[PDB]
Write a protein that binds this ligand. Sequence first.
Ligand SMILES: C[C@@](O)(CCO)CC(=O)[O-]
Ligand SMILES: C[C@@](O)(CCO)CC(=O)[O-]
Ligand SMILES: O=N[O-]
Lengths: 377, 374
Amino acid sequence: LDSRLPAFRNLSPAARLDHIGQLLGLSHDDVSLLANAGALPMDIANGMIENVIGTFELPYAVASNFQINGRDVLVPLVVEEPSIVAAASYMAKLARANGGFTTSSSAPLMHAQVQIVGIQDPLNARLSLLRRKDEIIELANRKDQLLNSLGGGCRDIEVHTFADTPRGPMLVAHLIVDVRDAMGANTVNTMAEAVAPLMEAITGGQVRLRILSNLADLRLARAQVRITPQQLETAEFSGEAVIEGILDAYAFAAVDPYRAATHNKGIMNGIDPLIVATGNDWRAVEAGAHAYACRSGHYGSLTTWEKDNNGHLVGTLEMPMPVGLVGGATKTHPLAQLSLRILGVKTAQALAEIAVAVGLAQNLGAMRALATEGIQR
Amino acid sequence: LDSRLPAFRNLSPAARLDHIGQLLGLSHDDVSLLANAGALPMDIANGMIENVIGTFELPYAVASNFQINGRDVLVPLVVEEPSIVAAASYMAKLARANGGFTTSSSAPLMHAQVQIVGIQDPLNARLSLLRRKDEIIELANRKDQLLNSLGGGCRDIEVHTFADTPRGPMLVAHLIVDVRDAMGANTVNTMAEAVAPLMEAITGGQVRLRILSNLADLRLARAQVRITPQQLETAEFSGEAVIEGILDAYAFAAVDPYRAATHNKGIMNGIDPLIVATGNDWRAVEAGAHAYACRSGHYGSLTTWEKDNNGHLVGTLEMPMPVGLVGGATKTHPLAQLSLRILGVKTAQALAEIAVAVGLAQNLGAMRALATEG
Ligand SMILES: C[C@@](O)(CCO)CC(=O)[O-]
Ligand SMILES: C[C@@](O)(CCO)CC(=O)[O-]
Ligand SMILES: O=N[O-]
């Protein structure tokens, strides 16, 4: 596949959809999902959420030029705001010249929390749970035989205590669960429910919340990009000077939360529209992202920007990225399935990897524009 | 208006729509925008973003039962996830019994940052800016006379310094701008650009970034709700026990970021779909929400939950809420305009107030379900 899509931005929507079809070998039926409005049947919309009275459209676009670990990919995006898809495409174009985006990711591990109140000896109870870890993990893994058969399941437990609470001490067990190609919520919630009685028995507390964490910091995805000064030269500024301007803008984000919130918002302009295009939950991705940004005690930048020893601009993005290829709208929305076809992803973690590449590209594009805009006279 | 809509959840989409239309006195042609696919035509979609190949639908729903400062409202919501709209509607139902949601908000004030580098005396240069603040403010306000006539404009400046970074000394001025019924990005960015040469002249420094902040902590919206124990009683649990269980859940969110992230995610399940329904930028709302939640130095809960001196459960939500009736895609998308017509909102801050009410209801619904599951 060649994702360069020459002249794409200036073709008609019909021509763009043709050129996509050719590259991919899309079927007639697949292309027809965009012949006309109303690809989401009302019977499916009505089954998705409650109190449905119709549907609401956003534009559906494809960013060009992306390359992930040497392989070109086409990226579908759904959003209302201008400049995003262009910026993504242009920064991907520049990235290609230097090897494109390089990505990696964790296993698809999610936390399930089990909160236990009213224990007199929570610190001791924590060790009683840890002594009985294998029993808890076995129980967690009893029911979902499809998940187990696919190579997922509860791998481990950790237990945390919060001594200092206006509502008494709490103990919080986390099941660590490999959820394969799902986002994970229903999978891990179900496990948390199943193990709760046993935990109660072991600790003598009352179980309260049994619930996933959206701070999915064992489900990380990672992207790298490199840009050379020659690529960043403008009519006004040397590429070297633009690189120094981008580093200055990164440092500003890193120290000032008022800057970091906006900087990170620009990452999410890249990521969220891919989450929407694939029928995935963008509130989960948002929460994970921003809570991770402040894990240090200070709300900072999710990306990093540096200059390497050759003077090249190098950027990273590592962050939680819980997404699915299965579940809910990702399965039932015909255009979420189309999006997955367009992407070519074979695992949820491959989707996550593309997500962070396009977040990284978006932040780069935003920073580049802000760094190179002349001052008025 | 009566927002109760009994058996709404069991009507067909067509019957629900016809009921809304009759309630609101929508025109045939307005109803037709939801009764048929394709209210966003391709020539509009193609002009909205780049590299367009089609459109992508989500369901468009209406939550029932909401009441805001004593006035019933209907709330459009666009999202993919089940349980949200039902929970919003059911928690609104319970709220109504005790006066509904009570809301307030600040003026629609947004920050415009202007970053200055290249000077060895940033702390001094700050005072130079402050000494000439009226000149800066007047220059900002020359750039948008209409906004000033609409009752907005640059009100003030604040200036912050970062004398020791790994990239050298920085100074950051903030324009503080009342943006009336806009989200405010383009409005404040334009002012930031306009004042940049004057700030260079004053400081001797070089202006780098000119850009809004999404941490919109001078644009707050507030909601309150009250729930009694009789309303929360289940077959398994006394309502008093449920209230204690919700207070336990809250304290857990307040101490553990792993829990707070999820707790706040539930709030945004309620808010973001209204932001989408109104053609607003949900990334901006998300960034403001989560960055605000960690302004203390610890990422905590956006809501609060307490028991008052009658034993009632009382909840709050106060947070940044930058949204528009104008600007961006609020005006471009025909269904964004219809959503605003359904809501009846006459200012952006009124929309913000509904947003926090819905977020508060959603969090309540989530916690109630988590506290009552055997
Ligand atoms: C341009 C930006 O504000 C996003 C606009 O939607 C991001 C940033 O400031 O880096
Ligand atoms: C139920 C919840 O996880 C949202 C599900 O989308 C929120 C919460 O845990 O409070
Ligand atoms: O290869 N790192 O996941």
